[PDB]
Curated annotation (Swiss-Prot):
Coiled coil (residue ranges): none
Broadest EC class assigned to this enzyme: ligase
Protein name: Adenylosuccinate synthetase
Primary role: Plays an important role in the de novo pathway of purine nucleotide biosynthesis. Catalyzes the first committed step in the biosynthesis of AMP from IMP.
Gene: purA
Cofactor binding note of this UniProt entry: Binds 1 Mg(2+) ion per subunit.
Taxonomic placement: Bacteria, Pseudomonadati, Pseudomonadota, Gammaproteobacteria, Enterobacterales
Species: Escherichia coli (strain K12)
Catalytic site positions: 13 (proton acceptor), 41 (proton donor)
Amino acid sequence: GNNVVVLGTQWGDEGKGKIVDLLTERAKYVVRYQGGHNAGHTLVINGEKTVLHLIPSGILRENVTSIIGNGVVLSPAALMKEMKELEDRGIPVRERLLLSEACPLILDYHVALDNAREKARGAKAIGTTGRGIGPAYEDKVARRGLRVGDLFDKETFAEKLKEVMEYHNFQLVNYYKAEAVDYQKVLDDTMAVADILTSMVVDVSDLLDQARQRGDFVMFEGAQGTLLDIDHGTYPYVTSSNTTAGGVATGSGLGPRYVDYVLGILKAYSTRVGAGPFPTELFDETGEFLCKQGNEFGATTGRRRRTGWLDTVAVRRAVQLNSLSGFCLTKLDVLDGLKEVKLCVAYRMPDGREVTTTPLAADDWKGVEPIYETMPGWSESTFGVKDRSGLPQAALNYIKRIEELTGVPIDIISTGPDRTETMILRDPFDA
Ligand SMILES: Nc1nc2c(ncn2[C@@H]2O[C@H](COP(=O)(O)OP(=O)(O)O)[C@@H](O)[C@H]2O)c(=O)[nH]1
Ligand SMILES: O=c1[nH]cnc2c1ncn2[C@@H]1O[C@H](COP(=O)(O)O)[C@@H](O)[C@H]1O
Ligand SMILES: O=CN(O)CC(=O)O
Ligand SMILES: [Mg+2]
């Protein structure tokens, strides 16, 4: 179909960046619809590495116009940082990036608050990325937050900012006993780049409506993952935006009836960064092996990611929540050499029940134990393989099994971090 959504079906870091960069070869637009610079992606073209955060993963292609929808919480500082980085490398961001006037702005006091609140929580700290996402979403929802559209009137923005900062500073110093964040500093920093920012502003809703009528291939790119969703994730150990497919319409302005194919990025094993339930988490040698072989360290905070087996019970939650059309299995190559691979097929509740559905809030996950199916692993190298025939039968079985257990076809298989090390069995666009 024309409108294809690409999002994470686990806890983020499944390989969205690469897959979006690969697939956008036929796309006209690429849209970020939620999150902020909390995300981190690594694209790799012929060995050249690119780490993105706020900017969409279709920025390396000139034929594509990258858009960051209203659902995104925009950090002026963060954007500029990535802009210069990409520009010095020959990628003209200003020319291929459009942004929404509705996008809320992430200013310094948000990071201060984020750190403050995270400290206050103490032992039950969420383990947030420390980029001010939560507080940004908060001001938005409260209706006191600033959006890109405010910047258009430098006078009143300065005024509006003045009061909001008084507001936050009061609690920052009084309640949290933390240092105040200087207004003038925020005003100067922000004013220093306003003209650049405002130049990329477009009416993205109306635009996507127009693109739709023309039949333009559009790709929506999700940040984070399903189980990190504000409503449906392992609350409160989640991010403050709807990471699920429903965030596409709220976060871009496109009517929900116009989603043709939701491609779910599924990693061959699981990882999670930050606090929260993780039924299949491995603390043993295999965990170390997985972490090591998959270079599992957060591309935004550098933090070592928690690792574990693929959880089909949890993945099945992503299926229904996102209305998955197909899966893209990433990192199959990381399992090379394992004597055996296991996939969680059911949960054993703390009261004795065997269930194949997921608990909601984090608390209700507390004594939940995983029930596995153990399949033989494979010694053969699958790295860089671009054809199923190069895959050992075990790997093929592992693949068939996942499809069986989920009811969703694995339409794409990734065998390496490079754009070309992939197998496209069915293209979301012409399917
Ligand atoms: N071995 C291997 N590495 C991969 C593959 N796909 C992606 N990677 C790398 O694995 C990581 C995926 O994590 P991350 O970048 O945070 O994913 P994202 O946030 O969903 O875009 C990145 O460092 C990629 O460069 C794959 O198929 N195999
Ligand atoms: O892009 C991401 N990838 C993986 N984990 C993330 C990402 N963004 C946030 N998190 C996690 O989401 C939770 C809340 O963090 P926040 O979004 O920084 O406020 C923490 O568990 C973070 O580690
Ligand atoms: O790509 C995002 N990271 O893995 C999150 C982090 O660095 O905490
Ligand atoms: Mg990431």
